Amino acid sequence: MKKLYTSYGTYGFLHQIKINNPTHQLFQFSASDTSVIFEETDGETVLKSPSIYEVIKEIGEFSEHHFYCAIFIPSTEDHAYQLEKKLISVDDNFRNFGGFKSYRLLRPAKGTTYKIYFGFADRHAYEDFKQSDAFNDHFSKDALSHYFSYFERYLYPIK
């Protein structure tokens, strides 16, 4: 089963994992509050105590030169199955919006906070998409609150 593993630490800490494990496809980025690294695989991860997720839906490939927004979507044992089906059924049309690169819908291994990655050309492209109806009506705090610390972590490429 394909899973995504995310670890947090300083740039130098995570970059050492990267370079120690060259056979693994690890993507490292700068967030405003921490450095972040992830890999997606159906095999073993090289990360230690990562946050683990099953990949429920995906479009597109990861790239170290893309901007990502990670959306954390809090929910409860009793709302989680309905949240999932809802996020599943969203119209794929966003895939054609300017600057779109990738999408991941992520079911947590522990607890009930769902995660979405949106990959775009740059930050502006994501923030333009975030204002559209396709986003506001499906992926916003307002849109999802009937299934409720919702927040966004922005991930910038490393220079």
From Swiss-Prot:
Subcellular location: Membrane
Domain ABM: 67-151
GO terms for cellular component: membrane
InterPro entries: ABM_dom, Dimeric_a/b-barrel, Heme-degrading_MO
Modified-residue entries (Phosphohistidine), positions: H66, H79
Coarse class of the protein's main subcellular location: membrane
Cytoplasm keyword on record: no
Gene3D superfamilies on file: 3.30.70.100
Keyword annotations from UniProtKB, A to Z: Membrane, Phosphoprotein, Virulence
PTM characteristics: Each of the three conserved histidine residues contributes to TRAP phosphorylation. Phosphorylation is essential for TRAP activity. Phosphorylation of TRAP is activated by RAP and necessary for the induction of RNAIII gene expression but not for ongoing transcription. TRAP is dephosphorylated from the mid-exponential phase of growth, which is when agr is activated and AIP is produced. RIP acts by inhibiting TRAP phosphorylation.
Function: Signal transduction protein, which is a major regulator of staphylococcal pathogenesis. Phosphorylated TRAP leads to the activation of agr system and consequent RNAIII synthesis resulting in the expression of several virulence factors. Up-regulates the expression of most toxins and genes known to be necessary for biofilm formation.
Family: Belongs to the TRAP family.
Identification of the protein by name: Signal transduction protein TRAP
Gene that specifies this protein: traP
